[PDB]
Paper text:
The active HIV-1 viral protease (PR) is a homodimer with 99 residues per monomer and belongs to a larger class of proteolytic enzymes known as aspartic proteases (also called aspartyl or aspartate proteases). These enzymes contain an active site with two aspartic acid (D) residues, one from each monomer, essential for coordinating peptide-bond cleavage. The HIV-1 protease is one of three essential enzymes encoded by the viral Gag-Pol polyprotein—the others being reverse transcriptase (RT) and integrase (IN)—and becomes catalytically active when Gag-Pol subunits sequester at the inner cell membrane and eventually dimerize during virion assembly and release from cells. Activation of the viral protease enables rapid coordinated cleavage of immature Gag and Gag-Pol precursor polyproteins into their fully cleaved and mature active forms, an essential process for proper virion maturation and formation of an infectious virion.
To better understand the interaction between HIV-1 protease and GS-9770, the protein was co-crystallized with GS-9770 and the X-ray crystal structure determined at 1.3 Å resolution. The iminohydantoin moiety of GS-9770 engages the essential catalytic amino acid residue D25 in each monomer of the HIV-1 PR homodimer. Additional hydrogen bonds are formed in the P2 pocket between the imidazole and the backbone nitrogen of D29 as well as the P1′ carbamate to the backbone carbonyl of G27. The primary interactions observed in the P1 and P2′ pockets are hydrophobic in nature. Molecular docking of GS-9770 to the active site of protease showed a similar binding mode as the PIs atazanavir and darunavir with each of the four substrate binding pockets occupied by GS-9770. In light of the fact that the iminohydantoin core of GS-9770 was found by X-ray crystallography to engage the same D25 residues in HIV PR that are present in all the off-target aspartic proteases tested, these data indicate that protease specificity can be attained through modification of the P1, P1′, P2, and P2′ drug moieties. GS-9770 demonstrated an apparent inhibitory constant (Ki(app)) value of 0.16 nM against HIV-1 PR as compared to 0.023 and 0.009 nM for the control PIs atazanavir and darunavir, respectively. The V82 residue is located within the inhibitor binding pocket and makes van der Waals contacts with GS-9770 in the P1 pocket near the phenyl-triazole moiety and with the difluoro group in the P1′ pocket. M46 is located near the edge of the binding pocket, close to the flap residues, but does not make any direct contact with GS-9770.
Numbering used by the authors:
A (entry chain A), B (entry chain B): 1 to 99
The structure:
Amino acid sequence: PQITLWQRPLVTIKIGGQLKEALLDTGADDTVLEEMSLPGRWKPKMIGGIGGFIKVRQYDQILIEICGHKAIGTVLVGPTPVNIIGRNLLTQIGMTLNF
Amino acid sequence: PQITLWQRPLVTIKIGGQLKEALLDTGADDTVLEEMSLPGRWKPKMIGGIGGFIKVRQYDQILIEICGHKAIGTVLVGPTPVNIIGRNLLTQIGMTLNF
Ligand SMILES: CC(C)(C[C@]1(c2ccc(-c3cnn(C4CC4)n3)cc2)NC(=N)N([C@H](COC(=O)NC2(C(F)F)CC2)c2ccc(Cl)c(-c3ncnn3C(F)F)c2)C1=O)C(F)(F)F
């Protein structure tokens, strides 16, 4: 499919038993989700964007259902104002920019 | 052309007659550039949400060329991690996400 950019490109994902709305974000290196429970070990990280930085927990090897795919990747969990699918997952579903 | 997402989608832009590197950012509503001089008057805008908010200068109807595609639109100037081409200009150049 083709997703135009007249509006924020939002999709529904399934992760950790939960459904979430998230933004397809080519400006994000990694996926960042609002606070939620995830399995496995994690390590703290600081991530920067407009306005400064927030502290998040980094989980690796997380399965996310998105755009008809089952993709594996890193998920950062913390006080993000929006759920974000970053490039680390976008590549796995074959998403590209085209013009 | 098609741009994959294994690396940051950095491209060359031209603004004010000068070449700069900028990030094609589907997660950005707006285009925000590192400090530079632009013509005319500006108006205030507040953007952000990652650890805080930043004041930026908003300039309207600015000529900016992105990968050879000429656009004219709103450019914000302020303290951004890197020059960002947001959806306001990605739409002008016909950019979409595809999978
Ligand atoms: C992954 C990050 C970087 C977060 C981030 C994001 C996206 C959407 C919202 C969002 C949407 N709705 N809401 C509100 C309703 C609740 N919040 C909030 C944050 N995603 C993204 N692409 N951008 C860029 C900056 O990206 C970068 O710096 N990239 C990097 C590169 F430069 F190196 C990696 C640094 C950007 C530029 C210019 C603008 Cl105007 C906007 C923008 N559009 C809308 N709001 N904003 C706001 F941010 F100003 C975003 C982000 O800041 C991270 F890491 F912080 F989480």
